[PDB]
Write a protein that binds this ligand. Structure first.
Ligand SMILES: N[C@H](CCC[C@H](N)C(=O)O)C(=O)O
Lengths: 324, 323
């Protein structure tokens, strides 16, 4: 008796999910659904199944982990899957989360299924820690920083600059801000104080380096609001040292107890592989959704509705004896 | 609206009284003390003798037990749980299983709900050890307790022959902490993680100071750690040793299929450890109040409670704001 997992999308996250399932003995991968031509990419990939045959697996999959891919169904297809399976997704558009929740709720309830929306590290683990911080310390301030990581949007922006062959951008928490937040003194940080941006650019022959540096730094919407540093490197260095697969971040609650005592709570992540970590979170939550589906839970839920006990394959007794 | 009863008025109890003030949806019904019935520390309103506990039946929604002990909780916990929903911070890890069993039986029978062992450890740290373990199944977990008193160890030394009074501190070792955060994974010996520093006020009848170091060779408590012992006067202790600050770290260093280094960390830096525990107890009382109203009965731990239950905000407000 194993939890039967199904993966939709075989991009970085889908591949990571397949790997993560290998680290979970209570789980088994039933199929990986892709839009790609199976006849083109197959032979031993027994698990690969064309997306058109997804409906044929509504009895073989307990939880469908939605790893979109990078198309469009990364927003409108989950509702399609929810109508036929219990789902788990990492919908990361914070501003549109309330909308996605409503749509997924109506659909999952209608189909008698349960859908977990917006899990991963952010949304997900960071969300949980923001909630925990303001709940434990109602009087104080919450600060979320997103550790060194790439902003695809900004990398595309860099490439539009005259004289730029190729390049990459990173957003990085400023140590000074982290130190201040971590101390007891509560304060509100300006955009410019929380994060800085570092770019690594490969210039075209000639180009005018100083002009590129300024074109990027004064770029509105992307860099204008942040202290930005531009490093000029070769194409070789770019491929070698900027795969851009790592990330991290910090969630800090700086509060005061009645009396002015400084109380600080911090949660952070340092991920060599952002995608694989997100996949691991997705798989852990699949165990939770499975348990909940079996209890008869219907509708959409978020990480905020799920007790951590559901994330473990161990029994309640074992947890209270080992970890509490 | 949520009616809270505070049981015990030591540091945690005092902290709960203040923390309740930081929560609009809560009200303090009374503070129950075991101080002599005849004359208390100023019988003024708030304080009420423990004998009157029974009279508050149906006027108190949650009884927060602030009787920092555990041994006392073994018996006092069940007694209260048979009359009210309860929340405690039972901190003896080894005996948590027994405590849970007893409180569960009692609360179930009385139709109440009892949250046991919340606080920062057990409690918050417990939640993060579980989280780390679930998200990164292949890896190692390391818990460190920042510089602060280790209460029990203070009592432990107060048991040494010739010790009038004293205090001990546990201090993480920077080296182990850095390694843990490195994501390399590696077992540590108790001695590699923390060191212990004691400050003892000798009951110097002329008592042997060198023998006072029974502390160092003391099984469990010390000996497994490099322990330093400083002798001082009750005057020095009282003024320079108000071991109120504390903290800790819970680090999970793992690898995902393929060898990618993934590190998760949760830590606390508390100027007032007791008041922080007090805040944790109050937030969880809100969750217990809600669970009770839903019909939940029996014993629960922080591992069974969704984080949304800790907030007075609506599920929609949380999703729109924090998700
Ligand atoms: N006191 C708790 C947690 C110990 C955690 C500790 N073993 C570590 O993670 O380093 C227990 O024994 O159940």
């Amino acid at each position: 008796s194993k939890i039967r997992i199904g993966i939709v999308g075989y991009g970085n996250i889908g591949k990571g999910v397949e790997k993560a399932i290998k680290q979970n003995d209570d789980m088994e991968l039933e199929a990986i659904f892709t839009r790609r031509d199976i006849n083109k990419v197959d032979s031993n990939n027994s698990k690969l199944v064309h997306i058109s045959r997804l409906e044929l697996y509504k009895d073989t999959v307990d939880v469908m982990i939605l790893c979109g891919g990078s198309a469009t169904d990364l927003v409108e297809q989950g509702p399609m899957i929810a109508s036929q399976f219990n789902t788990v997704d990492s919908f990361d558009n914070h501003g549109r989360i309330p909308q996605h929740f409503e749509r997924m709720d109506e659909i999952s309830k209608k189909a008698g299924n349960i859908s977990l929306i917006s899990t991963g590290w952010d949304p997900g683990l960071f969300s949980l820690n923001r909630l925990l911080g303001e709940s434990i310390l109602p009087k104080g301030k919450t600060h979320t920083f997103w550790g060194k990581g790439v902003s695809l949007g900004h990398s595309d922006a860099i490439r539009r600059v005259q004289g730029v062959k190729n390049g990459i951008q990173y957003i990085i928490p400023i140590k000074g801000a982290l130190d201040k937040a971590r101390s007891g003194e509560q304060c509100d940080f300006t955009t410019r104080e929380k994060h800085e941006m570092v770019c690594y650019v490969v210039p075209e022959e000639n180009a005018d380096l100083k002009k590129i540096e300024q074109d990027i730094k004064t770029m509105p919407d992307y860099f204008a609001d942040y202290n930005t540093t531009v490093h000029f490197i070769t194409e070789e260095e770019l491929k070698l040292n900027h795969a851009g697969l790592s990330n991290g971040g910090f969630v800090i609650r700086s509060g005061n107890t009645q009396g002015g005592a400084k109380q600080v709570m911090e949660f952070n992540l340092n991920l060599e592989s952002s995608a694989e970590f997100t996949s691991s979170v997705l798989v852990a939550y699949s165990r939770a959704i499975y348990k909940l589906s079996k209890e008869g839970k219907k509708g959409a839920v978020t990480v905020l509705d799920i007790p951590f006990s559901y994330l473990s394959p161990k029994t309640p007794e074992e947890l209270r004896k080992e970890l509490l």
